[PDB]
Design an enzyme around this catalytic site. Structure first.
Site, mmCIF file in Angstrom:
data_model
loop_
_atom_site.group_PDB
_atom_site.id
_atom_site.type_symbol
_atom_site.label_atom_id
_atom_site.label_comp_id
_atom_site.label_asym_id
_atom_site.label_seq_id
_atom_site.Cartn_x
_atom_site.Cartn_y
_atom_site.Cartn_z
ATOM 1 N N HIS A 121 42.703 29.839 53.232
ATOM 2 C CA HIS A 121 42.470 30.718 52.076
ATOM 3 C C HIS A 121 41.042 30.552 51.544
ATOM 4 O O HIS A 121 40.314 31.531 51.402
ATOM 5 C CB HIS A 121 43.486 30.444 50.961
ATOM 6 N N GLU A 122 40.637 29.313 51.264
ATOM 7 C CA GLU A 122 39.287 29.045 50.754
ATOM 8 C C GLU A 122 38.183 29.460 51.721
ATOM 9 O O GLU A 122 37.176 30.030 51.317
ATOM 10 C CB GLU A 122 39.113 27.561 50.400
ATOM 11 N N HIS A 125 37.411 33.016 51.658
ATOM 12 C CA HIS A 125 36.397 33.343 50.648
ATOM 13 C C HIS A 125 34.990 33.014 51.147
ATOM 14 O O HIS A 125 34.049 33.780 50.932
ATOM 15 C CB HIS A 125 36.630 32.600 49.316
ATOM 16 N N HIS A 131 40.656 38.684 47.259
ATOM 17 C CA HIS A 131 42.116 38.587 47.268
ATOM 18 C C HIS A 131 42.809 39.874 47.714
ATOM 19 O O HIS A 131 42.310 40.987 47.489
ATOM 20 C CB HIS A 131 42.662 38.143 45.907
HETATM 21 O O1 LIG Z 1 40.763 30.035 45.409
HETATM 22 C C1 LIG Z 1 41.108 30.714 44.453
HETATM 23 O O2 LIG Z 1 41.552 31.975 44.580
HETATM 24 C C2 LIG Z 1 41.131 30.289 43.012
HETATM 25 C C3 LIG Z 1 39.751 30.450 42.426
HETATM 26 C C4 LIG Z 1 38.847 31.031 43.421
HETATM 27 C C5 LIG Z 1 38.244 30.374 44.474
HETATM 28 N N1 LIG Z 1 37.494 31.297 45.138
HETATM 29 C C6 LIG Z 1 37.595 32.528 44.549
HETATM 30 C C7 LIG Z 1 36.999 33.712 44.911
HETATM 31 C C8 LIG Z 1 37.311 34.781 44.104
HETATM 32 C C9 LIG Z 1 38.150 34.669 43.024
HETATM 33 C C10 LIG Z 1 38.738 33.479 42.671
HETATM 34 C C11 LIG Z 1 38.442 32.389 43.467
HETATM 35 N N2 LIG Z 1 41.381 28.843 43.080
HETATM 36 S S1 LIG Z 1 42.993 28.358 42.817
HETATM 37 O O3 LIG Z 1 43.011 26.924 42.637
HETATM 38 O O4 LIG Z 1 43.617 29.203 41.814
HETATM 39 C C12 LIG Z 1 43.847 28.735 44.335
HETATM 40 C C13 LIG Z 1 44.485 29.945 44.466
HETATM 41 C C14 LIG Z 1 45.156 30.233 45.632
HETATM 42 C C15 LIG Z 1 45.178 29.310 46.653
HETATM 43 CL CL1 LIG Z 1 46.032 29.721 48.105
HETATM 44 C C16 LIG Z 1 44.531 28.097 46.508
HETATM 45 C C17 LIG Z 1 44.518 27.053 47.568
HETATM 46 F F1 LIG Z 1 43.925 25.906 47.149
HETATM 47 F F2 LIG Z 1 45.770 26.704 47.978
HETATM 48 F F3 LIG Z 1 43.804 27.421 48.661
HETATM 49 C C18 LIG Z 1 43.866 27.805 45.342
HETATM 50 ZN ZN LIG Z 2 41.512 32.758 46.362
#
Ligand SMILES: O=C(O)[C@H](Cc1c[nH]c2ccccc12)NS(=O)(=O)c1ccc(Cl)c(C(F)(F)F)c1
Ligand SMILES: [Zn+2]
Ligand SMILES: O=C(O)[C@H](Cc1c[nH]c2ccccc12)NS(=O)(=O)c1ccc(Cl)c(C(F)(F)F)c1
Ligand SMILES: O=C(O)[C@H](Cc1c[nH]c2ccccc12)NS(=O)(=O)c1ccc(Cl)c(C(F)(F)F)c1
Ligand SMILES: O=C(O)[C@H](Cc1c[nH]c2ccccc12)NS(=O)(=O)c1ccc(Cl)c(C(F)(F)F)c1
Ligand SMILES: [Ca+2]
Ligand SMILES: [Ca+2]
Ligand SMILES: [Ca+2]
Ligand SMILES: [Ca+2]
Ligand SMILES: [Ca+2]
Ligand SMILES: [Ca+2]
Ligand SMILES: [Ca+2]
Ligand SMILES: [Ca+2]
Ligand SMILES: [Zn+2]
Ligand SMILES: [Zn+2]
Ligand SMILES: [Zn+2]
Ligand SMILES: [Zn+2]
Ligand SMILES: [Zn+2]
Ligand SMILES: [Zn+2]
Ligand SMILES: [Zn+2]
Lengths: 161, 161, 161, 161
Positions: A121-122, A125, A131
Site C-alpha cells: 500500500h505505502e 503511494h 486511494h
Molecule cells: O498511508 C495512508 O493512506 C495513510 C496516510 C497516507 C500515507 N500516504 C498517503 C498518501 C495520500 C493520502 C494519505 C496518505 N496512513 S495510515 O496510517 O492511515 C494507513 C492507511 C491505510 C493503510 Cl493500508 C496503511 C498501512 F500501513 F497498512 F499500509 C496505513
Molecule cells: Zn494510503
C-alpha cells in the site's frame, strides 16, 4: 476506482533506487528486505519501471521505521492512530515510505499489522498511486494474510506508467 | 447476572485449539503458558469443551501481547485506558485474545495487573461470555490475587455449553 | 501548614515492613535500595516507628516502578502528566508507593526527576502525610538536589505519630 | 530578523563549561559528542566566548536526552509534539539543552531529525538567541542535511557578545 496524485507525479527515469534505512525490532532485517522486494515487485511486474536496491546514502525511495518526529513534517504519534505514510514521486522526501515503530508488524506468523500488505500500500503511494474507491484494491484507504494487486490497482499503475 | 454475545456465538466443535502467539517482557514465557492453561481450565472443567494447545500457525484462539495497532480494528492505545480485548467465538479474529504490552502484567509476585485474572476474563469472552451485573463474577465489566469462577460465571458458561 | 489524610490514617504497629518490588532501568537496583532507605529514615528518625525491609511477598509498604495500568485504580499515563502516587496507611494497597517508569529518574548525577526527593514525598504519603501549604515543605503539592525535611514536615509527622 | 531573550541574558564569563549528561540509543555516544562540539563551535567561532567540556557533575550547559518528566517544569510528551528545549544563559537550569528521547535522531545517515541542526538551534538558545523571522536562519522557529549559520544568526550572536 483508482486515483493518482494531484498533477500525476511519477518517476521519470527508467530506474529507481531504493534503500531500507531503518528496521523494526518486530522482525529480522532480512525478512523486511524480502517483503519490501516482493511489494515492489508486485507493482514492478506490471510496468516499464525497474528498481535497484542500495544500502547506503540516499536513494530515490528511502524506506524505514521510526518513532515520533523523524525529519519530515508528519511526526508519528505513538501506538495507534497513524501507522505509516509515503510520499508521491519527486525529489527529496518524494517517494519515501515510513512506518511507525510504535505499532506491531508481522510477516504473517504472529500478531500484528501485515507488513507485506502495508508495504505494498505505502510503496503504491511511493510510485504515484492515490486511494481507490474499490474495496478490493490494495490502495483502498483503510486496512492481508493472502493477497495480490486487484484489477483496479493494475489498471491504475499501468495508466500512470 | 451473566450475559452472552448477541446471537449466542459459541464454539461448535468438541475441540478448540489455542496458541500463545506473542509474549510479554514482564514475565517468563513458561509462566504465561501456565497461567493461560489455568485460565482456560477454569472455564473448561465446567463444560463439554476441550482445548488443545498448538505452537505455530493459526489456532481457533490466538492469544498474544501487542503494542498499538496489531492487525485488527481495535489498535491498542499505550499505557492506561484499554488493557486488553477478546472476540466472541467465530472464524478469523473470532475467539482471539489480545493484551496491551504498554501496561504492567504480573504473576502476582510484583506490581501489575494480575495476568491470571485478566486472562480468565478475556478468555471468558473468547468462549462467548459477555459481561455480568454480579460484582463477584470474573466477567464483571471492571477489574485478583486469589480467585475462582463465581456461581454466576459457572451458571453462564454452562448455559451456553 | 501540613495536612494528614481524611480521618488521620496511620500505621498502628510499632514496626512497618517495606519491599521494593520493581526497579527502574534509569538506575542501579542498589541505588534505588539506598535512596529508599534514606527517604524512609528521614521520616523515621522523627517518630516512634520502625521500618523493616523484606525482599519477597507482601509488605505493608510495597514500592515499585510501573508503566501504564498496574493493578490499582490509577493507571500511569506515559511520559509527563502524573509522575507517581502513594496511598495512605491501611491494609491492601494502603501505604504503597508507585513511580511511573515513563519519566526519567536520577540519583542526582544525570538529567531527571530527583528520586530521593520524589521518594521522600511519596513515602510521606505512605506514612499518612497530606500536602502542605508551606513552599519549603517536602510535602508541598508540586515538585531537590540537596534537601531535608522542613520544620512543617517534622511538625506534621510528629503530630500524627 | 534575530531576537535575544527578554533582558538579554548572556554568559558573562570568558569560559563556559558544558557536559553531555545523557545520550540516545539512536546514535553512538562519540557521534553525539562530536556533533555537540561542532554545533557549539559554529556559534563559538563568531564570538569572544570559549567552551570547555566536562564529563561529570554540573556544568554551565547541561546537555542531554530524556523521556517524559526530567527535573524541570517542562516534561517531554512522548513521540511527536515537542522535540527539544533549551534555557537562556543563567544559573541553575539556565543554559541547559534537553532532547526528547521519544523522537528519532540521526547523524544524517538514517531516518530522523537531523541532530546537528537541532543541536545548533537549541544551543543557540543556550547562548541567548531567541527566534528569528528570517526563514534562512537556524534560529527560525520551525524545523538540515547541509547547513551553516545564516547572516542573521551571525549578526544576532555578535550583537549579544
Ligand atoms: O498511508 C495512508 O493512506 C495513510 C496516510 C497516507 C500515507 N500516504 C498517503 C498518501 C495520500 C493520502 C494519505 C496518505 N496512513 S495510515 O496510517 O492511515 C494507513 C492507511 C491505510 C493503510 Cl493500508 C496503511 C498501512 F500501513 F497498512 F499500509 C496505513
Ligand atoms: Zn494510503
Ligand atoms: O475486556 C474488556 O471487557 C474490555 C473491552 C472488551 C474486550 N472484550 C469485550 C467483549 C465485549 C465487550 C467489551 C470487551 N477491555 S478492558 O481493557 O476495558 C478490560 C476490562 C475488564 C478487565 Cl477484567 C480487563 C482485563 F484486562 F483485566 F482482563 C480488561
Ligand atoms: O504524589 C502526588 O502528590 C500526586 C498524586 C498523589 C500521590 N499521592 C497523593 C496523596 C494525596 C493526594 C494526591 C496524591 N502525584 S504527582 O505525580 O502529581 C507528584 C506531585 C508532587 C511530587 Cl513531589 C511528585 C514526586 F513524584 F516528585 F514525588 C509527584
Ligand atoms: O526549541 C524550541 O524553539 C521549541 C521550544 C523552545 C526551546 N527553547 C526555546 C526558547 C524560546 C522559545 C521556545 C523555545 N522546541 S520545539 O520542539 O518546538 C523545536 C523547534 C524548532 C527546532 Cl529547530 C527544534 C529542534 F529540536 F529541531 F532543534 C525544536
Ligand atoms: Ca526520496
Ligand atoms: Ca502510530
Ligand atoms: Ca480465531
Ligand atoms: Ca493501553
Ligand atoms: Ca500496602
Ligand atoms: Ca506519567
Ligand atoms: Ca545550567
Ligand atoms: Ca515529543
Ligand atoms: Zn515520515
Ligand atoms: Zn486486538
Ligand atoms: Zn470484558
Ligand atoms: Zn499505582
Ligand atoms: Zn503528593
Ligand atoms: Zn528539560
Ligand atoms: Zn527554538
Amino acid at each position: 476506482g483508482y486515483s493518482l496524485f494531484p498533477n500525476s507525479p511519477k518517476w521519470t527515469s527508467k530506474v529507481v533506487t531504493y534503500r531500507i534505512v531503518s528496521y523494526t525490532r518486530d522482525l529480522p532485517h532480512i525478512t523486511v528486505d524480502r517483503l519490501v522486494s516482493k511489494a515492489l515487485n508486485m507493482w514492478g511486474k506490471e510496468i516499464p519501471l525497474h528498481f535497484r536496491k542500495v544500502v547506503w546514502g540516499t536513494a530515490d525511495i528511502m524506506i524505514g521505521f521510526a518513532r515520533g518526529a523523524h525529519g519530515d513534517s508528519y511526526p508519528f504519534d505513538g501506538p495507534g492512530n497513524t501507522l505509516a505514510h509515503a510520499f508521491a514521486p519527486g525529489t527529496g522526501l518524494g517517494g519515501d515510505a515510513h512506518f511507525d515503530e510504535d505499532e506491531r508488524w508481522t510477516d504473517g506468523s504472529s500478531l500484528g499489522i501485515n507488513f507485506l500488505y502495508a508495504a505494498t500500500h505505502e510503496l503504491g503511494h511511493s510510485l504515484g498511486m492515490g486511494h481507490s474507491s474499490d474495496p478490493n484494491a490494495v490502495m483502498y484507504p483503510t486496512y492481508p494474510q493472502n493477497f495480490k494487486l486487484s484489477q483496479d490497482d493494475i489498471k491504475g499503475i499501468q495508466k500512470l506508467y
